[PDB]
């Protein structure tokens, strides 16, 4: 259709029926791209960010965000979320 309730670049018919992004534009899914490399994304058409991460649905789907993000965070359902942790190695105690 043409309705866009979330104001992104993916209309709210592909956003719930299944869409794939090629040539920086969204197209319908027909499984013919199955044996080519394209995946099938499905998201929520009432919110700009389906997962909650700063990048929006279209930015996540196309791949216009920072180019160091793993492909597992490609589709809108998965969220880009670092889990940075600190591992301790040793101590040195200065006796004054």
């Amino acid at each position: 259709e043409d309705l866009d309730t979330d104001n992104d670049n993916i209309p709210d018919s592909y956003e719930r029926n299944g869409y794939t992004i090629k040539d920086l534009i969204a197209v319908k899914w027909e499984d013919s791209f199955a044996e080519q490399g394209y995946k099938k994304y499905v998201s929520n058409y009432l919110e700009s960010n389906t997962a909650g991460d700063p990048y929006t649905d279209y930015e996540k789907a196309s791949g216009s965000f920072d180019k160091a993000i793993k492909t597992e965070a490609r589709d809108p359902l998965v969220a880009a979320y670092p889990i940075v942790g600190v591992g301790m190695e040793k101590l040195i105690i200065s006796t004054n």
Partner: protein, 100 residues
């Protein structure tokens, strides 16, 4: 969370609550959620990351107490009775450890 040898993965997957209908996030089963958030590959019904299978009969899969209670409540009310077909819910801390 996946805990393969000398590595870890800590993905987050969106889940939908059915107690108040305004969210339109698609409902995700746990198995396809794992295969979606890990980029896994399917051969004929099995999940492979690179060369180590991940499956209910090939891994050690551990919940929290609340998550285990939710899983148990949603299995006897089904037919297949296989965990990898259980509807995802918010607040589920699954942990997968592949065998040595």
């Amino acid at each position: 969370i996946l805990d393969t040898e000398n590595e870890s993965y800590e993905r987050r997957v969106t889940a939908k609550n059915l107690q108040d209908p305004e969210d339109k996030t698609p409902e995700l089963t746990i198995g396809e959620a794992i295969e979606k958030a890990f980029g896994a590959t399917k051969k004929d019904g099995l999940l492979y990351f690179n060369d180590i299978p991940i499956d209910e009969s090939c891994v050690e899969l551990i919940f929290d107490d609340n998550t285990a209670n939710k899983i148990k409540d949603s299995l006897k009310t089904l037919s297949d009775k296989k965990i990898y077909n259980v509807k995802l819910e918010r607040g589920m801390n699954i942990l997968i450890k592949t065998p040595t």
